[PDB]
Design a protein around this ligand. Structure first.
Ligand SMILES: NC(=O)C1=CN([C@@H]2O[C@H](COP(=O)(O)OP(=O)(O)OC[C@H]3O[C@@H](n4cnc5c(N)ncnc54)[C@H](OP(=O)(O)O)[C@@H]3O)[C@@H](O)[C@H]2O)C=CC1
Ligand SMILES: CCCCCCCCCCCC(=O)SCCNC(=O)CCNC(=O)[C@H](O)C(C)(C)COP(=O)(O)O
Lengths: 395, 127, 216, 84, 39, 134, 347, 60
């Protein structure tokens, strides 16, 4: 004999289509909203699924490296790095120290551009356009280093099994060092416009709140973990190159809101600058690729002077190396999180199965939990902090 | 509270078809297909889609097929697929078949395929 | 458990000695002895975490996967709080074609574990979404690419492939180019799908040597 | 319990039954099992019930669909039901 | 002929431990979802 | 680690640290030593349902005994944190997380296996070991 | 269904493939008037089946943009500068072609080109040029149904004279004579709608008595394919009328119904009055450039062709001889285009 | 480079020299918890740490 209480109903099943001030790529987002507040978000993906994983199965191991560069167009080096590390683990190949240094250096460089693009495109999505243009000039300076080492500004394909494709051109280390001398001042200029700004604070504070338990449950990595209070970095917890030698501190925040992750990314840029300076000063001298010529191509004079080297060149550029039967999962700290490749080999010259673990796939899965109770405008900021790349999400 | 007077899925596909038939008007209104096609006309196509999978008898394969057919229905119902998809894949071929006039060929099936192509297994487009 | 930042300075260590030893050499034996019914076989091989270490691989059956995953996440000594990914590999030579692979992380142990469930096309694998929320999309992808059904999944739908796609592309019997192709027609002002025609066919180059031995 | 005349509803149901490809020829009347006299398939039976749904503006329970078997049974079901 | 004594050992062992459930011939082809003219 | 906040705070206060890194999200309780002792003893009481000659029960008993010892010699609550590599709050949440899976383990009873149970284990031998020396 | 060959000599050698875009069809076609409404669909049908289509066009890159998508690489050849008076260009266009389709026509006169040039001189000149070659095997000319030598309208009379000239030079040519063609880019329903909606009053010649047999564009395009797939069709004129014969009043009423116009805006501009209102405006047209304001509807020729019954003669070839069932133009997909405008649940 | 005039791949062949051994584990034999927790520290002083590997293996 006590009255029951009824409730309310939600409608407005909107479709948020491909939208330019958002994370780059095409996003189709179906949102159920009670009034102006979202109740469910269902991201529709597959709009950039190019069948990469199945295409890898039909190519040789060296022929499949350019796939990883194009999986993530912002951070190419980190993406191909995991593939070459997995092949190296299965092949039992040891990388010379100079090549290990070159890999760590360029990995930090691509990390820096990734963070620059992420922060300034997020500010553009908010509506501030000056940091964005102020950033493209820096990103051009770093693309110039890429075009110097590889001849391609974006899809270098520079990392190879056992080392790097070519050696560093003379004069590169000086130029990188000059860009480093001025980088901190440029970053401070960007930081003043974003940090301390009342409108930016209001837009980003307490938006997209994540807790450490939630991050581990949903499989998140990188800035999302470190903005919530988790002292976990693969470069430190599970080193994969001469990163162990390198001296740098993990940036940690605790709130988990959008602002905390932005601050983490800026500090990550600074830590990457420190790692680059250490790489520049301690760069060794010697071989840049593995001495073994049954897994690495011989030098051109050597193929033109030796019969064994011509044989090795012919059989490596036609058949490729044979990877011993086995399975491995090698992960690297990509700028967007943890990127890993699960490679299955049956003993042939082609991969049998190459699963790609997307750091952004789990973040897009986390979108629904994060964007609950938010508004249509908050979705853009939340997408910005996830920093999702849909060619990277859709393999 | 007691007296002596007191107390005195082989057809899973049928249920899925019933679900499709009951959901047909909703997809007609959602996909603006009222004028182009009738409800009965679409109800006819759905049976042929069901009949293609008749030979299977294993229960587990039947379960998988039913789940996939439910997915096909859900795509139209949830607006994943669009109006032009419905036109292209269901309504247009059914209307084309009705409008088709053909001469009853006196040549047997072998002669016609022999005249047509060397390898009968290869498909023909725009027949 | 959760690697909440505790030490402000001098946390140079990768981990403690005891935590490393228990997971470097006792982890598989500990799992087998503690939960014997779940495990059928175990493989210690090249480590997922690193080149120098060794990480376990555990083979279990589909019925025991949920309980094994629940044990792995919440056991005090073994805290695999994270599901890195879920994957399937198609082996047409085997009667049980598909091998569903689970990759986990223990932040406390700084270790990686791999769990394999071997199934066929008809059998289903119980969903582990209640143990790890990240599983939902991974199992949806496994269903899309390989056709492995996951039981008690909240909503098992295709993710990557086009709407109306019925085949499972990553199956080894699926053609690399597929069966259909997409073109716009002027007559019918619609984008339509048609059977495949290739202007230039894919050229498979057979590079295998008779003298090779690594091929298994 | 016949809300509307038995002759009218019967003529209408047999009119819809004729629309199906078979269920005709020499015997289209009462006392004809859908699947054992008329050659109808189960899906065709369900569609026929949906066509009767359109004709008489009233729904049929699925368990009743398990119970319905004959031309007599369907007309009996529709006459019994007040909405008709 | 002796033994590979490598990953193939665990490969064969996974083969002999596990097995597939029997189904009628051709039933899986319908589950595959490819055009039926393929068969 | 490095704080990403321009504001200056003291991380040796051992409470400002916890507030900064967000341990309060894990548990609103303070997480003292006595709470850890109580949680470990409650886990010991809980694992009584598992049969006495079960390897899992022996494992939980050994771990709880080790942690009760570590509480024993160390009178400082921070010292327990250093030895166990964890905040006291998450150490306490650990035993509850163990409590959560006891029902699932008592439904399937993994410890029941036949007296001929044998789990084959395959181990990888690296060539670097053999090539360099024997 | 079994694919039927294009009945062209030595096709069996050259043809190969399933019959799709990437397949090889042994038909090289020079379609004059490709960028037009009728020509574009014919180009689409021929090129869809793997054949090569040469499309001479008067310089206009944006108008011929859709034809670029029609075929695979190298199949649709677009020749930039087409003039009806240039013999050498016509010879170059049909050099490799074994079928030639002429869809070149003008609805109205201008200062540069009159009916007698386009509808008479060009067919005769092209007929001579095609005849001298010999490689061209099939010739198809597209004309109106109502075209007759004894017709009041100058357009429909010149078209028939040009068709007779074509028949004289090439005896094996096929004269396709479709009715008012309905399509998305048609000039029938689109002009009627523009008349009903953006014009002060909709003048209807007489009371809409004139009977017409409208046909859908896809049906005519398929009919062209069926003409080319049979050599027995050569030398015959096919009156491709629609499935239903309708008076103009019915079509106006049904457009008003489908668009859900408030009421009937059509007025009775009976004949003998249009013959006085538009008669000077024809002389106006012949001395002025192309102007969007007035055209087609606002001519004495249109009034003269809307006082007669443009219907197929009783004894005549049609869609049935080509084994095609024409689709109704008042229902179904044909009428979707007008349907999108308004259906009363719309706006 | 000491490989110019001294060529021996079989000595430097790590790819094809990997192998897999086999063991059988049984539930009857108890696990050695003495190994796991006997070496575990009981006080802060006894804590021992594993340093991060500085470089990955190289042939030199
Ligand atoms: N309602 C219809 O559509 C019907 C059409 N027909 C007949 O089919 C033919 C074309 O139909 P339609 O396509 O609708 O008419 P269009 O005017 O739409 O197509 C005319 C084509 O001829 C070209 N053309 C016209 N005059 C010249 C010229 N002086 N020199 C060079 N090229 C020229 C045009 O090119 P540009 O664009 O540069 O002028 C255009 O490509 C006409 O003869 C018409 O009577 C038959 C039955 C009904
Ligand atoms: C516009 C939206 C359209 C949606 C289209 C949806 C199309 C779905 C197609 C899926 C087809 C299936 O499920 S096929 C379901 C599995 N196929 C089987 O054959 C199992 C048992 N089959 C039979 O009993 C008979 O073949 C049968 C004729 C089915 C009699 O159905 P009943 O068991 O009752 O007697």
């Amino acid at each position: 004999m006590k009255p029951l209480t009824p409730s309310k109903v939600s409608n407005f099943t909107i479709n948020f289509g491909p939208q330019h001030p958002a994370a780059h790529g095409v996003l189709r987002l179906v949102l159920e909203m009670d009034g102006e507040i979202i109740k469910r978000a269902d991201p529709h993906i597959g709009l950039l699924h190019r069948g990469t994983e199945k295409l890898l199965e039909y190519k040789t191991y060296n022929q499949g490296i350019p796939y990883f560069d194009r999986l993530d167009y912002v951070s190419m080096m980190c993406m191909e790095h995991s593939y070459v590390l997995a092949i190296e683990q299965l092949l039992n190949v040891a990388v010379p120290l100079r090549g290990q240094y070159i890999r760590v250096l360029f990995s930090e460089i691509t990390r820096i551009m990734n963070h620059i693009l992420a922060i300034t495109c997020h500010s553009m999505d908010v509506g501030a356009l000056t940091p964005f243009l102020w950033a493209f000039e820096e990103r051009e300076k770093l693309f110039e280093f890429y075009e110097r080492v590889s001849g391609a500004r974006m899809h270098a394909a520079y990392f190879r099994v056992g080392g790097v494709a070519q050696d560093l051109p003379i004069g590169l280390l000086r130029d990188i060092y000059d860009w480093s001398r001025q980088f901190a001042s440029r970053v401070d200029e960007m930081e003043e416009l974003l940090t301390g700004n009342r409108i930016w604070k209001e837009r980003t504070i307490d938006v997209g709140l994540v807790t450490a338990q939630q991050a581990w449950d949903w499989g998140c990595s990188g800035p999302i973990l470190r903005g919530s209070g988790i002292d976990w970095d693969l470069r430190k917890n599970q080193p994969y190159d001469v990163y162990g030698r390198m001296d740098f501190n993990v940036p940690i925040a605790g709130h988990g809101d959008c602002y905390d992750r932005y601050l983490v990314r800026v500090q990550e840029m600074r830590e990457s600058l420190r790692i680059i300076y250490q790489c520049l000063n301690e760069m060794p001298d010697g071989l840049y690729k593995t001495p073994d010529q049954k897994v690495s191509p011989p030098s051109r004079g050597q193929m033109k002077q030796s019969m064994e080297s011509l044989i090795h060149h012919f059989k490596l550029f036609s058949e490729g190396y044979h990877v011993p039967a086995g399975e491995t999962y090698r992960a690297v700290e990509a700028p967007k999180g943890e990127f890993g490749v699960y490679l299955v080999s049956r003993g042939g010259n082609r991969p049998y199965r190459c699963k790609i673990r997307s750091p952004g796939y789990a973040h897009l899965q986390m979108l629904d939990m994060v964007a609950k109770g938010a508004m249509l405008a908050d979705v853009v900021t939340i997408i910005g902090t996830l920093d999702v790349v849909f060619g990277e999400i859709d393999r | 509270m007691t007296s002596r007077f007191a107390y005195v899925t082989c057809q899973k596909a049928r249920n899925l078809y019933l679900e499709a038939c009951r959901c047909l008007p909703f997809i007609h209104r959602l996909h603006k297909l009222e004028e182009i096609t009738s409800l009965k006309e679409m109800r006819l196509i759905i049976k042929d889609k069901f009949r293609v999978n008749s030979p299977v008898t294993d229960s587990r394969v039947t379960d998988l097929l039913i789940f996939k057919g439910r997915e096909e229905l859900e795509t139209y119902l949830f607006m994943y697929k669009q109006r032009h998809h419905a036109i292209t894949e269901y309504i247009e071929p059914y209307q084309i078949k009705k409008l088709l006039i053909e001469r009853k060929s006196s040549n047997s099936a072998f002669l016609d395929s022999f005249y047509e192509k060397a390898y009968p297994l290869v498909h023909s487009k725009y027949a | 458990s959760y690697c909440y930042a505790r030490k402000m300075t001098d946390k140079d260590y990768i981990a403690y000695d005891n935590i490393k030893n228990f997971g470097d050499n006792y982890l598989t034996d500990y799992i087998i002895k503690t939960v014997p019914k779940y495990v059928t076989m175990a493989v210690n091989g090249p480590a997922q975490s690193s080149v120098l270490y060794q990480e376990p691989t555990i083979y279990t059956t589909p019925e025991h996967i949920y309980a094994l995953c629940a044990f792995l996440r919440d056991h005090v000594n073994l805290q695999y709080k994270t599901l890195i990914d879920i994957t399937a590999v198609d082996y047409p030579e085997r009667s049980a074609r598909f091998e569903v692979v689970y990759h986990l992380l223990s932040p406390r142990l700084n270790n990686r574990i791999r769990i394999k469930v071997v199934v066929d096309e008809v059998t289903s694998v119980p969903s582990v979404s209640r143990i790890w929320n990240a599983a939902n999309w991974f199992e949806r992808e496994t269903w899309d690419m390989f056709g492995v059904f996951f039981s008690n999944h909240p909503d098992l739908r295709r993710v990557l492939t086009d709407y109306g796609f019925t085949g499972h592309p990553l199956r080894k019997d699926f053609p690399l180019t597929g069966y259909t192709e997409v073109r716009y027609d002027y007559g019918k002002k619609r984008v339509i799908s048609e059977p495949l025609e290739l202007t230039q066919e894919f050229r498979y180059f057979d590079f295998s040597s008779p003298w090779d031995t690594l091929s298994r | 319990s016949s809300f509307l005349p038995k002759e009218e509803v019967e003529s209408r149901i047999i009119a819809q039954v004729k629309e199906q490809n078979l269920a005709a020829g020499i015997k289209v009347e009462l006392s004809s099992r859908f699947d054992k006299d008329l050659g109808l398939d189960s899906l065709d039976k369900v569609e026929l019930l949906i066509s009767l749904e359109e004709d008489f503006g009233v729904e049929v329970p699925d368990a009743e669909i398990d119970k319905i078997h004959t031309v007599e049974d369907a007309v009996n079901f529709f006459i019994s039901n007040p909405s008709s | 002929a002796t033994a590979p004594q490598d990953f193939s050992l665990a490969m064969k062992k996974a083969d002999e431990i596990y097995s597939g459930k029997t189904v009628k011939a051709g039933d899986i082809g319908f589950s595959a979802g490819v055009p039926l003219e393929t068969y | 680690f490095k704080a990403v906040a321009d504001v200056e705070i003291d991380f040796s206060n051992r409470a400002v640290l916890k507030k900064y890194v967000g341990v309060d999200h894990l548990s609103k309780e303070q997480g003292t030593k006595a709470k850890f002792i109580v949680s470990l003893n409650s886990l010991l009481e809980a694992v009584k349902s598992v049969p006495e000659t079960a390897e899992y029960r022996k494992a939980i008993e050994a771990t709880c005994q080790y942690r009760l010892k570590v509480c024993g010699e160390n009178n400082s609550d921070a010292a327990i944190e250093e030895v166990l590599d964890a905040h006291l709050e998450e150490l306490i949440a650990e035993s509850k997380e163990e409590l959560r899976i006891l029902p699932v383990l008592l439904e399937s009873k993994p410890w029941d296996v036949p007296a001929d149970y044998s789990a084959p284990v395959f181990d990888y031998v690296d060539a670097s070991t053999i090539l360099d020396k024997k | 269904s079994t694919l039927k060959p294009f009945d062209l000599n030595a096709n069996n050698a050259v043809r190969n493939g399933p019959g799709g875009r990437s397949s090889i069809g042994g038909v090289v076609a020079t379609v004059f008037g490709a960028n037009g409404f009728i020509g574009s669909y014919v180009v689409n049908e021929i090129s869809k089946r793997g054949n090569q289509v040469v499309c001479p066009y008067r310089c206009n890159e944006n108008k011929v943009q859709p034809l670029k998508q029609m075929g695979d690489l190298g199949q649709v050849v677009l020749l930039p500068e087409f003039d009806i008076h240039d013999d050498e260009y016509i010879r170059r266009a049909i050099s490799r072609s074994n079928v030639v389709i002429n869809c070149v026509g003008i609805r109205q006169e201008t200062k540069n080109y009159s009916y007698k040039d386009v509808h008479v001189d060009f067919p005769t000149r092209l007929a001579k040029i095609v005849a001298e070659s010999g490689k061209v095997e099939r010739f198809i000319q597209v004309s109106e149904m109502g075209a007759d030598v004894s017709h009041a309208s100058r357009r429909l009379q010149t078209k028939a004279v040009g068709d007779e000239a074509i028949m004289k030079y090439i005896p094996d040519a096929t004269i396709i004579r479709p009715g008012n063609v309905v399509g998305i880019e048609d000039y029938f329903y689109n002009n009627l709608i523009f008349q009903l909606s953006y014009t002060i009053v909709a003048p209807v010649i007489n009371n809409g008595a004139n009977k017409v047999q409208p046909t859908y564009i896809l049906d005519v395009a398929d009919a062209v394919v069926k003409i080319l797939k049979d050599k027995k069709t050569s030398g015959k004129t096919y009156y491709l009328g629609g499935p239903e014969t309708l008076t103009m009043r019915q079509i106006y009423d049904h457009l008003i119904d489908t668009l859900r116009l408030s009421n009937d805006d059509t007025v009775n501009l009976r004949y003998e009055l249009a013959k006085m209102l538009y008669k000077p405006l024809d002389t106006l047209r012949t001395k002025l450039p192309e102007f969007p304001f007035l055209g087609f509807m606002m001519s004495s020729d249109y009034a003269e062709e809307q006082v007669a019954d443009s219907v197929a003669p009783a004894g005549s070839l049609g869609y049935k001889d080509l084994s095609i069932s024409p689709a109704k133009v008042t229902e179904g997909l044909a009428i979707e285009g007008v349907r999108f405008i308004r259906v009363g649940g719309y706006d | 480079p000491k490989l110019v005039y001294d060529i021996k791949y079989f000595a430097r062949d790590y790819r094809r020299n990997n192998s897999y051994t086999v063991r059988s584990v049984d539930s009857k034999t108890p696990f050695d918890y003495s190994k796991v927790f006997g070496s575990a520290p009981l006080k802060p002083a006894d804590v021992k740490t594993v340093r991060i590997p500085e470089v990955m293996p190289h042939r030199g």
